[PDB]
């Protein structure tokens, strides 16, 4: 009696699901064929709490002897630039305050789409993946220096 | 499973997304390993069960025949015949419960491990081939100087391929994970349900004749 | 051997359920089907005790 009762709710739940994964499947092949883009992710410069917020991957120079370049996820928040060490573990500061910063388009590096952030306490090298990501990251910082 | 994979960030490709793709896989593998342990224990019950009913049926012929050869009594001559069919009829119900048990092991559990992770793995395989491809596509794009234009263009054409087809792949992988989350409960619940149906059916066969046998 | 085999099997079936999130069906329904299964085994054991006693 428990079996057949439960079996009636059990079948209906998986009939409900069988539709469910068909909708996800149906949208995912619409997404894949028609709107699926190859350009790199681009951050969003939108106001947040504390002033301008933007977040995304950048290349930077490491403590390898050649100064070997390397990819990390960076956030601009509360007039500050931090970088992430691993996700959910706490971030590290890049510039104490961006509003005492300058942002250098750096035409003498040969490094594709490189910039340098020179602030009162601290300097840091950076690199964007694209000239679009160079001009938006340099502009997000330059607007942040103007905050 | 479903909420150990951020579907939300699969076009975005954050460290969040990368943490999730590594975290979700261990519960699929755990699960696969537990599914195999039930498919083997199930056949373990099918072999001892069947050996037990071969021993049981053979014993039932011999207990009756030994009594039939026993000294003459007319109530024993009919009663043992009532007994003989009862003894075998209860067994036939129990042979049927092994075969029902066997069919559900094929429909649910053996099917789940054989078929249900194939498409997730086919997506997972190509998705880490594209992730690996993407990581070097970006490496070779970052590490070419500005004056080496031609090498940079070759690496960025590969990246546009990698980033698109990696986005393509993250959706499938999100889909087949979302499928197994739902599927996993329903098949094991169906399997304990179809099992005890055959039990209720096997025990009713021995109860349907309980009155005549009494 | 059949009862050991069945008992190990019913332990194996429970083990699928506990790995999945806690929900009404896994937590309660699935266990109630499987404890009646261990009870049915023990009743089957009393029948092998009575087959041996009788014999």
Author numbering:
A (entry chain B): 215 to 361
B (entry chain A): 1 to 214
C (entry chain B): 51 to 105
Reproduce the article's own wording on this structure:
We recently addressed this puzzle in studying a GTPase-activating protein (GAP) for ADP-Ribosylation Factor 6 (ARF6), known as ACAP1 (Arfgap with Coil-coil, Ankryin repeat, PH domain 1). Besides its traditional role as a regulator of the ARF6, ACAP1 also acts as an ARF6 effector. This involves ACAP1 functioning as a coat protein, which deforms endosomal membrane to generate transport carriers for recycling to the plasma membrane. Thus, rather than its BAR domain, the main driver of membrane deformation for ACAP1 is its PH domain.
Overall, the ACAP1BAR-PH dimer is predicted to oligomerize, both longitudinally and laterally, in forming helical strands that wrap around a tubular membrane with regular periodicity, resulting in an “criss-crossing” appearance by which ACAP1 coats the membrane. Consequently, whereas the basic repeating unit of protein lattices formed by conventional BAR proteins is the dimer, the tetramer constitutes the basic repeating unit in the ACAP1 lattice, which is achieved by the end of an ACAP1BAR-PH dimer that does not contact the membrane interacting instead with the mid-portion (arch) of another dimer, resulting in an “end-to-arch” interaction between two dimers in forming a tetramer. Our previous reconstruction of the ACAP1BAR-PH lattice did not achieve sufficient resolution to identify specific residues that mediate these three major interfaces of contacts. Thus, we initially sought to refine the resolution by pursuing a type of molecular dynamics (MD) simulation, known as MD flexible fitting (MDFF). A grouping of 12 contiguous ACAP1BAR-PH protein dimers were embedded onto the cryo-EM density map (map resolution 14 Å). Overall, Interface I is created by four salt-bridges, residue pairs E122-R125, and E122-R129, twice in each dimer pair, and six H-bonds, residues Q107-E154, E122-R125, E122-R129, twice in each dimer pair due to anti-parallel symmetry. Interface II is predicted to be created by a portion of the BAR domain in the dimer N+1 forming a binding pocket, and a portion of the PH domain in the dimer N forming a loop that inserts into the binding pocket. Interface III is predicted to be generated by two α helices in the BAR domain of the dimer N interacting with the BAR domain in the dimer N+2 and the PH domain in the dimer N+3. Overall, as the electrostatic interactions are about one order of magnitude higher than the van der Waals interactions, additional analysis suggested that charged residues at the three interfaces should provide the main driving force for the protein contacts.
